[PDB]
Every structure is written in structure tokens, then in C-alpha cells.
Amino acid sequence: EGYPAEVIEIIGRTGTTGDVTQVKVRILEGRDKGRVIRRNVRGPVRVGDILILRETEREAREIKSRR
Amino acid sequence: KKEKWGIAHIYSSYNNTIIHITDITGAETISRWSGGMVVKADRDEPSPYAAMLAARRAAEEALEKGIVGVHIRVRAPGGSKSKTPGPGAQAAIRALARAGLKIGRVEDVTPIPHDGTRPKGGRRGRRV
Amino acid sequence: MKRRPRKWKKKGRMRWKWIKKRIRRLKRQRKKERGL
Amino acid sequence: KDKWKLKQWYVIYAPDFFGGVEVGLTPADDPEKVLNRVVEVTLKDITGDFLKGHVKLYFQVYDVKGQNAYTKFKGMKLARSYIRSLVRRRTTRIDGIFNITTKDGYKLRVMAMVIAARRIQTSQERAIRKIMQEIIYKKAEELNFKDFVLEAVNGKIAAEIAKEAKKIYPLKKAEIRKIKVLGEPEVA
RNA sequence: GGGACCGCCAGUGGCGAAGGCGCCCGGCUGGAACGGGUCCGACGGUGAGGGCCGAAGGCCAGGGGAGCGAACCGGAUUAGAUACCCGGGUAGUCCUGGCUGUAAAGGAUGCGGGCUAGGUGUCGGGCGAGCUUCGAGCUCGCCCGGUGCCGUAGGGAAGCCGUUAAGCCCGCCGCCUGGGGAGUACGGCCGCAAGGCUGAAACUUAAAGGAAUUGGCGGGGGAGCACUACAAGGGGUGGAGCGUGCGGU
RNA sequence: UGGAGGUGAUUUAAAUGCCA
RNA sequence: GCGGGGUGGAGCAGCCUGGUAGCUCGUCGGGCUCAUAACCCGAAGAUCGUCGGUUCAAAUCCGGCCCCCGCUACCA
Ligand SMILES: [Mg+2]
Ligand SMILES: [Mg+2]
Ligand SMILES: [Mg+2]
Ligand SMILES: [Mg+2]
Ligand SMILES: [Mg+2]
Ligand SMILES: [Mg+2]
Ligand SMILES: [Mg+2]
């Protein structure tokens, strides 16, 4: 409903057509409040961002050795 | 003492996923949930999400009848068929302790033959 | 049937396993129908 | 539904020669149903030293005197993950299986496993199996059912094979893999 | 309660004339390698005609039938689908007694003897040095016999073979003579049936086949691209009326 | 440097082509 | 015993539960393709055999009738 998370590192471009980006976020208020997970995002991303998500447990599938 | 414990049998293949919570002997069931009892598309009936939801609604109704911990037994079809667990195993185990239960020892009990019987197909496989 | 391996080569012809099967179905008729 | 509310929790007890201790709880309506349920607890849940966590025991009940399920030893087994890691290439496992009996008259079947240190011939592989039979049958003559089992799982027969067989070919990790009782004495 | 198969260790490892052979304990039985100042005294190589052994399948008689599954019955996919995919299933697959005698039965390489550089693994036997928790144990070197790889001289159209020859010699037997017609017709001898062994001519045709080389292509693999590609976006053409070019009449 | 084996997997439909 | 089918080039739906005449092979036009078959889209086509009743209002409820018929045999 409100869980924000703060990006710390980008991993690369997934996507059937180079659309989504895999990125390693860090939650900052709620159930984990400190854990590190991996998620796919749509759009552009720098480091230090603040995504808003809704589950805090999905852990997108690993990418092809980052290349 | 007053410490109830139990076992969770997690049966997973390429086509579905069943979670079964029983008492420590194994002979009295408490909660049994599947994947086609939550999702509707037969595509994602084996998916990780289906396991993640069923394995939550199992723990919910099994925690109310007193159970505090649970041991794990993960199983694949095995025998004269595939020996590798599907995609719901690591997802169900990971969303069973996140739901409030504890977790003791883990193990896999897939049945293996010492040179048993014959598979399907025949001498040429599934030439799909 | 005293076969020769030059004919399994499939280049400009049809399968030999299926030609033999058709020679047999004719030798069965030249024999029943007054191959006596 | 109420069907759950008519249940009743019983306390299971280990056998005598392992130390009568609590092992799990168990629900049922009437005790005439809790009469052949099989429990399984690792060795470490009874006087636990972290090292023998990979040995498992079986206890099967025979009596319900008012919220107490007294049991009787039934079998013993290692864990496939454990023995799954002692068998590598160039190491020549050796496998023995024997039917024996004891003083009380119990009949047992023991399945002990030796693991050489290299690749060896087979006429040098069956000498070891004969050694194992000869020190099992013997050891099963002066020891009763309760004392034989006490040391099979314990690890006091491994250190005897690992003595008389190391003088055939230097080995590693001889031990007992499974026990299953077959029959009872008609007496008692 | 019930029938079939014996996993990981398992190894261009072992045994057998080939087909082939994988749980453990006992009994009967065939062959080969090594060690041998043992014995007999050329007893040998090959083999037309004959003789036994021979995967899977099919057949004839009695049993058995768990899994799988030709024919066969249904669901789908497709323009059609007598097929590929799914749910079932009879003969078979297993045991005892016989017959058939065929495979890409392949090292596509018949069998015996002599000779012509090296290197390097690994299984069985023996010898000699070192260790040794004195174990039927571990390293290292040499001789003999099986089994793999790189490679001189030489051979070959080349691919590649190279003391396990496709090298240089001394033996014996089988088969080949452009592609089709054709392994067919006719005639014999086997088999209960299926079928096996032997096997031409009229006529037709200028090529059929082998090993390698540049390219092109793949509903093969990697690397890189491009708003006459996509993804993210802005404006539209395709429907109405007219301007102009084309087909047709 | 360079090769030889083994076990696994391999994804809806998708046919056809004057004349020089 | 007397009753049914009466409807695009067609084949039948489509009733009782009344207000699109309904889906498919066909017909001409356009897409896709280097081009043809298959595949997608658009229009044209009976207007319910016919008089009549019900019905605000009918293939749709039925009767009268015109056509095609239709399950059926010498009855000493
Ligand atoms: Mg040839
Ligand atoms: Mg002869
Ligand atoms: Mg089938
Ligand atoms: Mg063979
Ligand atoms: Mg396909
Ligand atoms: Mg073509
Ligand atoms: Mg077309």
C-alpha cells in the first residue's frame, strides 16, 4: 500500500525488446526495513531513487550473468 | 512442554503444487491446500505465485489450531517420471516462515528406483 | 533377399525399406492367383 | 468444525533403553486409534551432541494408559544426504546385508557399508564382506536385542570392522546404514 | 497380495569366436596371459562340398500378465490429418518345449608368419630398488601380454593409416567388371506359414558414383548494427469531395 | 595448443514456383 | 391417422420464452505476400408457401387454404 525502497545499484537491461531494468533495492520502512531484494522496473532509473512497491516479496528471477 | 510441532509435505511437479500440514506422527491431517484452489488459469497453476498464496492460506488455518513450528519434506513426482522439483518448492518454503511459523530441519524425499520400471514415449521420446 | 547398399542412399529415389515391401505384395499375388 | 474440538492430545514416550523422554504430541478421539502410529526423531533430540544429527530412529506405540503412549524401537536409518556425499568417483563402495538373530530371539537384518580409499579388485572386495559377516554374527551372540541396538546406532561396531578390514586395504568411514527388526520372540 | 528389472560406484575399464554379459552367498564347468634348464618330437597354415552357435521380430503348444504398448476406440491441430500431441487399450514383451536363420549382424577393414624411429596413459603377471599407520598398502624403473592418443620413413585420389598398417615380403580361400532392367521372370532344394538360398535376357541410357575447394543459403551457433526496424512517443494515410499519374475499356 | 565419448534437454501453426 | 417441409446460390438453424430473418461453404471488392493457395475485413443477396385470426406489435401463436410431399399395401 505504501512501501518505499531506495535503489543502490543497477544490474542491466532485461526485456523482450530492451524495456525493463533489473535493480537491487533496499526497503526503508515496514516489515523488512533493511533487507535487500531484486526487482525489475520500467522506465529510467538513476541511483538513489525511491521506488514505491506493493509486495516486498517477489525477488525477480536472476538475469543472464548480467550480460 | 505444550510445544506442538508438525510436518509440511510439499508436493510439486511441472503442473501443480500441494501443501499438506499434518501432526508429528503424520497420521492426522490439519490443513491441505493446492494451486488450482486459488488461481484460475491452468497456465500458472504451477507458478511460484500460486504456491506463495496457497502456502499462506495453509499456515493461516494451521496456526489457529495451535501449531508453532513445522518440519519440511519436499517431494517431486519421481519414480518412473521426472526427478526434479518444479518451480513451487523454493517459493513455498520461503513464504512459510514469513507467515509466522518456525522451521526445523529440511529434506527431500523423492522416490528413486534401484533400476525400476519403464517410462512412457518409447525408444523415440516425444517428437513434438 | 541379397541386398546391395548402393540403394539406401536416397539421392534420386524413394526409401528402400518401402520398395521391398511393395515387391513382396506382388510376389504374393503372382503366387496365389495361379502361381501354381 | 467441532470434529477438531473432539480431539485429544497424547504424549509419546521414547523406549526404556534410550531414556524415557517426551517426544512430540498427538491428537485423536479414542486411544484405540493411537496404536500403530510411527514417530521419527533424530538421535540428537535425545541427549543431543551436534555431531550425530544425521541418524534417525523409529518408535511405534503399543499402549495408551491415560495420555501416555509408550513405544517400541522399530528401525534405524541414516540420511540420503549424508551417504550421498561419501560415494565419489575412484572410491569403490562395498555393501553388505545380513539376517541375524539375538538372545531374546529377535530377528534382525543389518545393512553395513564400507568405503575403500581407492579402486580395488573384487576378490579383494569380498574378503572384506566375509570379515563383516563374521564380526556381525559373533557380536550378535552374547548381546541381547536391547544392547545390540544400543551400540549399532552408537558407533561401537564400526570401530571393529575399521580395525580388522584396514588390514586388507586402508579404508575410510566404515559404518552401519540401516536396521529393521523383523519378528518378536513368542515369549513375553 | 502381485509380476518385470538390479541405480549411484562405472572407468576410449574387463571377459567371450561373434550375437553378447552388471545385486549377494554357496556347488558344478570352458578359455586365455604371466613364472618354468618340466614333457612329447613337425603332430603345422588355409579350406570348395558338409556341421553346430546366431539380437529383435513372427509361428506352434501349455502357463503368466504389474509397466509399456503394433492393430483398434475416442479428444484436438489443419484447407484436409487415415499422422505428429492427449485419454484408453488386444497381440506381444516374462516362464517351459520346438521351428524360422534374418540386421547399418559395422573396425563398413578374412586368417597365419617375418621385418622397418620415438613419446605418452591404463588393465593382468613377474622381477629390482624406496617408503611403510608392517595393510592382499603407496611411489619409481625394466621384461611379457591386452587396450587408447600424438608422430618419423613409406603408402594413398585425398579424408587420413603409421610395430593393434591402409608399409616391404612368403601362403591359402571368398567375391568384383558402366548405370538401370533386377534381386525381378522361369526352373529346382529347404520351411507348418511368413519367408530363406540359387539367379538370367529383350530393351533402355552417357553418365551414375568418391574425397576435397571458392560462394550462396538454414524455421543452426556467436559478435555488431540501422526511425526506408522495433520499444517509448508526435502527426497521420485507409471512409467523403475535387487536383494529377497509371491499369482497363 | 588440439580432439574423442556419455547423459540430459531442444517451443502453436506455417504448402508451392514461367522462360530465356 | 391424416400429418409434416414450406425461408438468400445454397445447408439448416432460428419457435414454446414475440420487437435484429441467424451461423457456415458459395458470390464480387479490399488487405497480407516477390506472386499463388490458406488467413483477416467489408458489402450484395430470401425479406419466411399464402389469406386470416391472436397480437400495440409475429419464421417466433395457430387455423383456412396453394405446392412439395411424407411415415404405408389386392384387404379370400
Ligand atoms: Mg559399398
Ligand atoms: Mg562352404
Ligand atoms: Mg498413445
Ligand atoms: Mg552389434
Ligand atoms: Mg511446430
Ligand atoms: Mg520451396
Ligand atoms: Mg491469395
User: How many structural domains comprise chain A?
Assistant: 1
| Chains linked to B by 3 or more Cβ pairs within 8 Å | A, D
Residues in chain A with CB shorter than 8 Å from the CB of B52 are 57
D143's grid cell: 548381546
- Contact of B51 with chain A, judged by CB distance below 8 Å, is answered with no
Judge contact between B99 and B91, C-beta under 8 A: no
Three cell numbers at A12? 542491466
- Stated in angstroms to one decimal place, the resolution of this structure is 3.3
Q: Is the minimum CB–CB distance between A1 and chain B shorter than 8 Å?
A: no
Q: Contact at 8 Å (CB) between B21 and B73?
A: no
B74 near A CB under 8 A: no
C-alpha cell at D129: 564382506
Distances in whole angstroms, Cα of residue A34 to Cα of each of A4, B97, D52: 11, 18, 36
Are the C-beta atoms of residues B58 and B49 closer than 8 Å to each other? Answer: no
The distance of A57 to chain B (nearest Cα, Å) reads 9
- Alpha-carbon distance A24 to A12, whole Å? 11
**Method by which the coordinates were obtained:** cryo-EM
CA A22 to ligand 7 center in whole angstroms: 46
Gap between the Cα atoms of D103 and D140, Å rounded: 8
Rounded to whole angstroms, what are the CA distances from C30 to C2, C17, C21, C24, C35? 21, 21, 15, 10, 5
| Domain harbouring B38, CATH code | 3.30.420.80
Which of B's residues 96-125 have CB atoms within 7 A of nucleic strand F?
Answer: 125
Range of the domain at A24: 1-67
The answer to whether strand F lies under 7 Å from the CB of residue B128 is yes
The total number of structural domains that make up chain B:
1
Kindly tell me the burial class for residue B39, based on how many C-beta atoms sit within 10 Å of its own C-beta (0-12, 13-18, 19 or more).
middle
Distances (CA, A) of A38 to A59, B64, D48: 5, 33, 39
Burial of A65 (0-12, 13-18, 19+ CB in 10 A): exposed
Q: CA torsion D27→D31→D37→D41, rounded to 10°? A: 60
Contacts of D104 (CB under 8 A, 6+ apart): D144, D145, D185, D187, D188
| Chain B and chain D touch, per 3+ beta carbon pairs within 8 A | yes
User: Torsion-angle region of residue D90: left (phi > 0), alpha (psi -120 to 50) or beta?
Assistant: left
Looking at the partner chain, which of D11, D27, D81 has a beta carbon nearest the beta carbon of B28?
Answer: D27
| Residues of chain D found within 8 Å of residue B105, distances taken between Cβ atoms | 42
Beta carbons within 10 angstroms of residue D61's beta carbon: 22
Residue B91's closest chain A neighbor by CA?
Answer: A58
The CATH number assigned to the domain holding A49 equals 2.40.50.140
Query: Which 3-32 residues of chain C approach strand E with CB closer than 7 Å?
Result: 3-9, 11-12, 19, 23-24, 26-28, 30
D22 pairs with which residues across the strands?
A: D13
Give the whole-angstrom CA distance, residue D12 versus residue D162: 37
Q: Which domain range does residue B34 map to?
A: 1-128
Specify whether the backbone of B24 is left (phi greater than 0), alpha (psi in -120 to 50) or beta: alpha
The alpha-helical segments, DSSP class H, found in chain C are 17-27, 29-32
